[PDB]
Design a protein around this ligand. Sequence first.
Ligand SMILES: [Mg+2]
Length: 112
Amino acid sequence: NIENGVAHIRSTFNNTIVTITDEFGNALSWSSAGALGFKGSKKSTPFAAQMASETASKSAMEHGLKTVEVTVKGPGPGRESAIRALQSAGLEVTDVTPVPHNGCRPPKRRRV
RNA sequence: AAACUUGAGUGCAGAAGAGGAAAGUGGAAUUCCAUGUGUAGCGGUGAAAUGCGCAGAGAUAUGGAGGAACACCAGUGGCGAA
Ligand SMILES: [Mg+2]
């Protein structure tokens, strides 16, 4: 039984991943678009992200979690959908996208 | 040959600068490593597959190693012969 928690959202252009934990960082339940049998372009849709945070939150509340914080990441479109649905699963809502200070060289641009 | 001070230098008084060389200090991020939680995919594309993963990945939290580069400031802004 844990009541205070943190919800991590990792939304990219290929997949949305949600991990729920306390403030101590130890996870309790996670889901993703792939865990719901979505493949490819389906795995990145904003609708398909909400089906993942809803699944994740229901498992964390089963442990007894009521208040969870939000840490969002990535430019994936499944950001509002995965965050609003956090408040839509009986969870009380009380940006961590890594930016470098000019560090490592990024890969070459794609000539599609 | 002799004068001159405008050109060109010097002196004096101010100011600005990513100009150069050397040695130090620091924060973010990437990768790898370890540890704790924790479970079924992660990753990737037009769509896929190769690839990694149940021997515990990816995610998350903490710590460590190492190299490289210096967000914001930042501007037909500045400096330099290039
Ligand atoms: Mg002077």
